[PDB]
Structures are given as C-alpha cells and as structure tokens.
Amino acid sequence: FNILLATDSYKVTHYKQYPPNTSKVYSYFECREYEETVFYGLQYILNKYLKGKVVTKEKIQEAKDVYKEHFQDDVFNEKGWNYILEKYDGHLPIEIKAVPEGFVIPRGNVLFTVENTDPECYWLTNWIETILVQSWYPITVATNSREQKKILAKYLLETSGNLDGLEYKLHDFGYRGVSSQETAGIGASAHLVNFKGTDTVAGLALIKKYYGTKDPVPGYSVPAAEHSTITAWGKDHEKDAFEHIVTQFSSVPVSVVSDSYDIYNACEKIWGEDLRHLIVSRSTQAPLIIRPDSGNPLDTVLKVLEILGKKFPVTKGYKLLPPYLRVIQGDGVDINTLQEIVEGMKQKMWSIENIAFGSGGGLLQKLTRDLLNCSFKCSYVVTNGLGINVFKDPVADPNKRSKKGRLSLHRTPAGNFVTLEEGKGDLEEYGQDLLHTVFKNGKVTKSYSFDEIRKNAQLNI
Amino acid sequence: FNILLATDSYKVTHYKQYPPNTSKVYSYFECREYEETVFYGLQYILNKYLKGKVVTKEKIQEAKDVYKEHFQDDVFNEKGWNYILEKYDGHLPIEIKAVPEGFVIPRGNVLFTVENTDPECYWLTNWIETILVQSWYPITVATNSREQKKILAKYLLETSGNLDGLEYKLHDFGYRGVSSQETAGIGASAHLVNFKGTDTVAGLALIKKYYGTKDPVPGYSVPAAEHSTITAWGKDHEKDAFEHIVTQFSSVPVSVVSDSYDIYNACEKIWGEDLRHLIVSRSTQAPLIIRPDSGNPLDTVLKVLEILGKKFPVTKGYKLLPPYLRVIQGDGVDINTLQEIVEGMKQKMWSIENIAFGSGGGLLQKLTRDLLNCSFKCSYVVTNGLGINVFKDPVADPNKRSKKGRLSLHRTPAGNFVTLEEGKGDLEEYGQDLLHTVFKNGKVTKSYSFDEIRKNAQLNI
Ligand SMILES: NC(=O)c1ccc[n+]([C@@H]2O[C@H](COP(=O)(O)O)[C@@H](O)[C@H]2O)c1
Ligand SMILES: NC(=O)c1ccc[n+]([C@@H]2O[C@H](COP(=O)(O)O)[C@@H](O)[C@H]2O)c1
C-alpha cells in the first residue's frame, strides 16, 4: 500500500491550485442533513493506512513514475513528499479530531476534522480526503443496521412483551455479496456494533485486530445447511438430507434450507409428518430453524407459518410456535422489506419471536454514500497569515451547502448535540469540544475498544 | 489473510451434511438469466487468495480457536485441513476451469467450474464458494461500464459520425464512494476494461500487479479543480481562482468545477466575459473543461450548453462548441441518467463530442449481485462411486433453477455461445470446450494480460 497512490488523481494537481501564501487547510466530515448516525470505523483507517512511516524513498519514486505516465506530464509534487520523508521520517504532519466511536449523533453535525500541522503541507489535508471519506461505509452499515434493530425491537416488544433474543434477529449473510474481502470485514464489524449473529467471519478478525473485546469473539453462528448440502442427495432423497442433518446437529440450533424444490411440501409433509418425530423431541436450546429462500418474503413466511401451525402445536395475543420450531427468512431482506415482513406478521397476529432474519447484500452491499450524505469539505483556510471561513453553496441545491470556519461539537444544556461554526466553539458557551484528537503526526493518540463502541451505540430501550 | 477464515460461517459445518460416501463436488458460476456479461476478475482472486501454500499449522490453529468460540462448539474440520497441509504442502486440491477473461458471454451460461481433485477433499469445493463469488463485483462493474459505453457510442456516432474519443467519455470518480481500498482497485480495473479515463489510482496498481499491459499504464487523467481549490480563495475571489488554475495548466486540458456558488452566473459572466480571453486563446489539445456538480444533470447541462453557445462560437447537423471548450457532467451519473442526458442533448441538437461524464458511486458502488444474478451452485456430485446430476428448482421462483451435471461452454457455428449440460459436452458437436483450466492443486495454470481482456471485451461497430 502506497498512500501516494491512494487518492483521487486530480488531487495530485491541487497543490498548484490553492491561494498563494496558504498555510492551513481545515476540513471536516459530516453526514449532511436516518436522522441519527453511528460514528464507526475511523480507527481502522487510522492504524492500517495513516499511522507511522507511510512515506518512503521507494514509494515516492513509484508514484513519480506512475503519475508521469498517468498525466503524460510531471505534475506530481515530489518535493512536497520528500519533505515529509526527510523531516518527519515519513510521518504525516496532520491532526485528526473526532467524536468517540460508537457515538450516536443526529445529522448535520461535525464528526471529525483534519488539518495539516505544518504550513508547508497545506496540500496534505485534502490529499487524504479520498481515503478518509471511505469511513462512510462503516458509518452507514452500522447506522442502517441499528435502524433495523430499532424496527425489530418495536415489533418484538409489541408481539411478545420483551426483547429476548433481539441481538440475534438480524444475521449477517453478506460475505459473498460485498465487493471485496476487505469490505466484508469492515462491514461485518460495523454490523456487530448492533447484533451478535454473523456468518461473515472476516468481521471477527478485523474487530480482534483493531478494536478488541473482553469476550473471545464479537459474533457467533450456528450449523446450517445450504442448497448443495441438500440437493447433493438427489431430489427423491430430500427427506434423507433433512433427517441426516438434523440428527448430525441434534443438540444445537440448526438451520435447514427447505425450498430446494417445494418449501411448502417440505413443511407440510416432510417436517410436519415424515420427520415430525425428529423435531418435536428437540430441546428448546437447540430448535430446528426452517429456512425459506425464494418467492415473496412476506407471503412465504406467512404461508410457511400457517402450514407448520396445522402440523405443530401453536400457542400476549400473538401466535407462538413450539419452542423447538423456528423460522429464518434469509432472502430479499433489507431495511424496507424487513419492515414489511414484521408489520405483515403482526397483522396476521404472528409473534416476532417465531422468526429471525438473514440479510446479506441488503445489509452490507446495497448501501451508498448518498444514504447519509457522508461528505468531506473545506471550511477554514489560512492565506497570507489570515484565517478565513470558506464553504460551497450551489444555487440549484441548498442541501449541498457546507459549514463555515473552524468547527466544534458540544453537549447542549438539554443533553443534546450542537455543532458550532466560525471558531465559536473557542467560546465554550456549551462546555468543551466533544471532538478529540485521535491522530497526530503519524501517531494514533486515542483508541476505543469494540466494547466501548457497542455501549455508545446502544438503543435507548 | 487466512483462507480457513475466509468463508461463510455455515460452510464450516457442511462437511458433516453431505451424503456419505461422497468423493466429488462439482459446482459452477453463472450470471443467471444486461443480456451480455464481461467475465473479469477471477485471475485477481486466484493469485491473491488461492495460490500456493495457503494452509499452515498456524492458520489451522487460528481457525480452530476462532470457530471453537464462534460456534460455541468444536465443529471445525481440523482433520480435513491437516490432510491438505500434510498431503499437498498446504496447496488446495482444487481445479477451476473458466472462460477466458474479457470474454463477452450472454447470460445463463457457465463462466467457470470448481471441483476437488482428491476424494477426501469433496468439501473443499464449496468452502471456497464465498471468496469465488465475490468475482460478481468485477464482472458487474465491467459489464455495467461496457453497457454505458454502448450508449455513448450510439449517440456519439449519430451526432458526429465518428467514435473518436469514446474511450474517455466516461471517467471513474468512484474512489471515495466505494466501501474499501481493495474494492476501489478491483472496481477501477474493471472499468478500465472499457475506458481509459480514471481518477481511481488504485486500479492502475492492481492491473500492473495481476494482469499487465503493453503500455506503461491502463488509464489516464488530467488536472482538475476541486471545490476546496475554488472556495479557498473566498466567495468574492472566485474569478481569481479560475484564472490562476487555467493559467497554471494552460498547455494541458484542465477541468474546473464551476458551481461552488452559482453555476450559471459563472458560465455566462466569468467564463463568458471576464476570462473569455484566456479561453478562446487555448489549444484544441488543452481545452477548458467546465464542470457542473449539482442540480438536475440533464437540465443543468442543457442550460449550461445554451449559455456557452451564446458567448462562444457554435457550429452532421448537431451543434458544437469551439475545440478549446468542453463540458464534463460529474454528478448524478449512472447507467440510466447517462442515457437520459445523451438523449436530452440529442433532442436539443447538441453533439456528444461536446460532453464527457464522470461517474463515481453509480459506477463502482451502486451495484449488487442481483443485477446479473451472479450465483454459485452445485450441479454434479459423485456418491457411492456414481455421479448424479443435481440442482435446485424452487416452486415459487422458476428463475432460481440451476443447471444439471458436468458442464462445458461452446462456440456455435454461428459464432454464438451455448452451455451443454449433463456432460453432453464430451461430444464435439460444436467444437471444443471454451472453459480452460486456470487453477489446479494450488497453481495458476493459465493467465491473460489486460490487453487480451480489453481485446476480448471490445464492442462491435
Ligand atoms: N447461514 C446461512 O444459511 C447463509 C449464510 C450466508 C449466505 N447464505 C445464502 O446466500 C444469500 C445471501 O446473499 P444475498 O442476501 O446478498 O442475496 C442468502 O439468500 C442465502 O440463500 C445463507
Ligand atoms: N476529477 C474530478 O473532478 C473528481 C474526481 C473524483 C471525485 N470527484 C467528486 O466526487 C463526486 C463523485 O462521487 P459520487 O458520484 O459517488 O458522489 C463528483 O460529483 C465530484 O464532485 C471529482
């Protein structure tokens, strides 16, 4: 990894575009005004990509040769980097201030800020914008996940009276659905800020390496079948597949995909008759978890619950299946369908304790920077020894307006958050800044554990 | 990276669910029936994650410790992996056949197959499904990027009778909008299969390391301004920013974002009057590229085109701006809005040679496995010494039905593609199988250069 090659190309030519005599470039990151976002992921970026000696004679050479060919010109600021190499032993003269990871802050607030600690490197602050803006992913995943947790708590509570098992209603199935091995780990860890159910193993590695927890692992899983593990027996032997797997994993929870050929036939006949004796004998701590994987998410769940209800003993006002029988909808689930499904179940008078959800692509991939409008902007800049407040303000789009001057975040007397502009924070009217330095001159100054982060992101419930 | 930790959690328990006496598991990947996909990206995966000695005593122990806590049970198939370490020195007893990369194949066709080469490793085939499926991303970006090229080619050919400069009509801006550094490079290289304009430097590295090109680099870029490059000067001194920039880059093409305050009160006044002399004086090889970044993409472009048309000399029957002035729409661009904009310009009688497009999130992030239905499935298995064709066929979703038995791809006598199922491919009816062994027993057996891929992915016309 060469940080000199980890930025938008045009940013290579920027050092020649700022106002002469500029000794400071101050920028900030916000989820421009999901009215509530979870701040998570910076630490990962700090350690893995910005910490220590990121500049070397070799890397400078490599960049030089690349850009020379990339621009068909020699715009690369070779001298600017050698400076950092020769004076700071390849460490970035920058200071990043940010809110504690895990913090739930309303939109339109400053989350973190970046500024060069050396006037000569006034061009460095925005050079690292590209790599820093990717924190949108961890923030969005955690937030979107947390909002799904809210939807689940609301309905689980309404239909059962408690939230027993909430931490496991949304299971991560997004490993194969994301765009890369790295994205898998980042996103899966973001999801674990809110839940404990995951099949995206890469998530456990990242958390262990960059954040850490008291317990051995942040998330857990259970044995489960996949289509190949069923179809391999042959269509005529689907029942044999089911019987084998349930017996193999008899003393623990086990999920078996039942839609290989006909999910309904499977629930009514196979599970409800042919193997019924193997199911009802199951412990409450190790139930069978039937798993549909096709057709309309809400219709299939209701139709599957309706059938199992005629084959098994169904019992606050909502119908509950036997403690040894459960269902998991792990197909076509995203924040929107999730809402439709629980509301759809609530209507049909089905308790939510009867179900769990598996979300992959909709949980870790179908997310974008526009969702929370994660943006990095220049608000302050010193030119000719004079500090002026800068900002954009497109005419045809008042939403894209950025904040002005030096920023700071404060806890308001009423216990809320307020972001102050134009250095007004220096006047601690609402107390001291909430943003703390987490990085400075190649050194990670402040770090948080996954346990802290999890605590900070708890729901009000 | 630990391949023993790079799979979906439930796949760790699959070895105990397969039919007993199973010696082989044969699976395939396809983009279930965008009626034409660009196969690209496997080579990156094979070399970086599957090649060589990927199994070691350490990795076995690590994987064992994690899964013991993850499953709260000891289910990890330690004996299975030790066998691989002792028998093949950590090399994966797997063989992967695949259609040449860059190949443009219609959908519903097998793109690559996987199977174990040693009976005791029948479980390995689907253990690596998770990591192999992520190839959906490169395949999708490249395909989406190629379809957009078709659109640009169609309208640029009707408005100017020549595809000159098509290669640079769609610039990659998605570096910051993507979920990770690795995704950025993977996706960027994918886009570069069809174009040469990019700002996502990560892509140049990956191509150089895993594919290689005749030329020094796959993509190129030109100097461009950023909002902070304009606003740093101050609201009142926007014209100064513009002048300084166009001057700094007076001999090379330059892009200047001009919507920081008022896009229209910038093209008519500043660019059309105040600094017009610095513009009409520019070379055809270093024009001024005006860049709006907000408001309706189509409307802003059309309105900006009329302004510039009434301040500069305008000339197949379609309007054209002086060779020293051009426009790039680098906001709100995706496959769909791209079509609309080129369409809108056509109805307004403007030539496409007048504009270029920059796409970020829409290009590399707003995509999922759903788009092309990229799926990995088991089609052939050998149990009790006999091989049977297997597959899924969900009642409620005919679309999710999978192919049966050993597969092969063939070039029809009409220069088309066809997938022969049930090993019927052994019969040289339509020639020889196009799937080539690319990986076997831990070694990459066949590779392609980026030049071959681009060649294989070319468009008709
Ligand atoms: N434990 C499990 O049953 C499990 C885990 C991971 C992925 N998957 C499968 O892959 C899919 C997830 O990917 P998407 O949600 O992105 O389509 C699911 O629909 C499911 O069929 C299943
Ligand atoms: N050369 C360039 O002008 C350039 C390069 C990379 C990113 N960008 C910015 O980032 C945006 C693209 O990212 P998204 O389309 O994903 O929001 C553009 O609208 C632009 O404002 C601009």
Short mmCIF file of N, CA and C and ligand atoms in Angstrom, two decimals, chain A residues 8-10 369-370 400, chain B residues 171-177 199 221-222 224-225 227 255 291 293 328 330-333 358-362, ligand 2:
data_model
loop_
_atom_site.label_atom_id
_atom_site.label_comp_id
_atom_site.label_asym_id
_atom_site.label_seq_id
_atom_site.Cartn_x
_atom_site.Cartn_y
_atom_site.Cartn_z
N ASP A 8 -7.68 10.46 -5.19
CA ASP A 8 -8.25 10.77 -6.49
C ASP A 8 -7.13 11.45 -7.28
N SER A 9 -6.98 11.08 -8.54
CA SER A 9 -5.91 11.63 -9.38
C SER A 9 -5.84 13.15 -9.44
N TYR A 10 -6.99 13.80 -9.62
CA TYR A 10 -6.97 15.25 -9.72
C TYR A 10 -6.36 15.89 -8.49
N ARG A 369 -23.06 6.26 -0.35
CA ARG A 369 -22.67 7.46 0.39
C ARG A 369 -23.80 8.48 0.46
N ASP A 370 -24.70 8.44 -0.52
CA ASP A 370 -25.84 9.35 -0.58
C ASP A 370 -26.86 9.08 0.52
N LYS A 400 -26.51 20.97 -0.49
CA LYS A 400 -25.07 20.78 -0.59
C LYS A 400 -24.21 21.87 0.04
N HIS B 171 -15.46 8.87 -17.22
CA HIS B 171 -14.36 8.91 -16.26
C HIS B 171 -14.77 8.33 -14.90
N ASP B 172 -13.85 7.58 -14.30
CA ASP B 172 -14.07 6.95 -12.99
C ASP B 172 -13.81 7.94 -11.85
N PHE B 173 -14.84 8.22 -11.05
CA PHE B 173 -14.72 9.14 -9.91
C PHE B 173 -15.06 8.41 -8.60
N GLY B 174 -15.30 7.11 -8.69
CA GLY B 174 -15.71 6.35 -7.51
C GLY B 174 -14.75 5.96 -6.41
N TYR B 175 -13.55 6.52 -6.39
CA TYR B 175 -12.59 6.15 -5.34
C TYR B 175 -13.12 6.38 -3.92
N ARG B 176 -13.73 7.54 -3.68
CA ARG B 176 -14.23 7.86 -2.35
C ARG B 176 -15.59 7.24 -2.04
N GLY B 177 -16.38 6.99 -3.08
CA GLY B 177 -17.72 6.45 -2.88
C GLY B 177 -17.81 4.95 -2.68
N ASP B 199 -9.81 8.34 -12.24
CA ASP B 199 -9.23 9.12 -11.15
C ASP B 199 -9.03 8.21 -9.96
N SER B 221 -5.37 10.53 -16.70
CA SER B 221 -6.11 11.60 -16.06
C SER B 221 -5.54 12.96 -16.47
N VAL B 222 -6.28 14.02 -16.16
CA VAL B 222 -5.86 15.38 -16.48
C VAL B 222 -6.08 16.25 -15.25
N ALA B 224 -7.48 18.78 -12.68
CA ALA B 224 -8.84 19.26 -12.45
C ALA B 224 -8.94 19.94 -11.10
N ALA B 225 -9.86 20.90 -11.00
CA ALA B 225 -10.06 21.63 -9.77
C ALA B 225 -11.07 20.92 -8.87
N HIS B 227 -13.67 21.63 -5.28
CA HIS B 227 -14.37 22.75 -4.65
C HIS B 227 -13.49 23.53 -3.68
N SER B 255 -9.85 20.84 -16.02
CA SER B 255 -11.25 20.80 -15.62
C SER B 255 -11.41 21.71 -14.41
N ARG B 291 -17.09 22.07 -15.47
CA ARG B 291 -17.71 21.00 -14.70
C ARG B 291 -18.74 21.41 -13.65
N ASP B 293 -21.66 20.52 -10.83
CA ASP B 293 -21.69 19.45 -9.84
C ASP B 293 -22.94 19.46 -8.96
N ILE B 328 -17.95 18.57 -18.74
CA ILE B 328 -17.99 17.26 -18.10
C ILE B 328 -19.01 17.23 -16.96
N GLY B 330 -20.06 15.52 -13.94
CA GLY B 330 -19.56 14.53 -13.00
C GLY B 330 -20.40 14.35 -11.76
N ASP B 331 -21.71 14.47 -11.90
CA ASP B 331 -22.62 14.32 -10.77
C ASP B 331 -23.93 13.66 -11.18
N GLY B 332 -24.48 12.85 -10.27
CA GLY B 332 -25.73 12.16 -10.51
C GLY B 332 -25.72 11.23 -11.70
N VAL B 333 -24.53 10.80 -12.12
CA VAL B 333 -24.44 9.93 -13.28
C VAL B 333 -24.39 8.43 -12.99
N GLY B 358 -18.48 11.99 -15.68
CA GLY B 358 -17.72 11.46 -14.57
C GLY B 358 -18.71 10.72 -13.68
N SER B 359 -18.45 9.45 -13.40
CA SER B 359 -19.35 8.66 -12.56
C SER B 359 -18.59 8.00 -11.42
N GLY B 360 -19.06 8.21 -10.20
CA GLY B 360 -18.41 7.63 -9.05
C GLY B 360 -19.19 6.46 -8.47
N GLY B 361 -19.99 6.76 -7.45
CA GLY B 361 -20.79 5.73 -6.80
C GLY B 361 -21.65 4.92 -7.75
N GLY B 362 -22.25 5.58 -8.74
CA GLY B 362 -23.09 4.86 -9.68
C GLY B 362 -22.29 3.85 -10.47
N1 LIG C 2 -11.70 14.81 -11.26
C1 LIG C 2 -12.67 15.12 -10.61
O1 LIG C 2 -13.35 16.27 -10.83
C2 LIG C 2 -13.35 14.33 -9.42
C3 LIG C 2 -12.58 13.05 -9.19
C4 LIG C 2 -13.10 12.21 -8.11
C5 LIG C 2 -14.25 12.51 -7.29
N2 LIG C 2 -14.92 13.79 -7.62
C6 LIG C 2 -16.19 14.31 -6.86
O2 LIG C 2 -16.84 13.25 -6.18
C7 LIG C 2 -18.18 13.02 -6.92
C8 LIG C 2 -18.35 11.69 -7.46
O3 LIG C 2 -18.66 10.77 -6.44
P1 LIG C 2 -20.19 10.31 -6.35
O4 LIG C 2 -20.84 10.39 -7.70
O5 LIG C 2 -20.16 8.90 -5.91
O6 LIG C 2 -20.99 11.22 -5.28
C9 LIG C 2 -18.27 14.01 -8.04
O7 LIG C 2 -19.61 14.53 -8.15
C10 LIG C 2 -17.23 15.06 -7.71
O8 LIG C 2 -17.87 16.17 -7.03
C11 LIG C 2 -14.49 14.68 -8.66
#
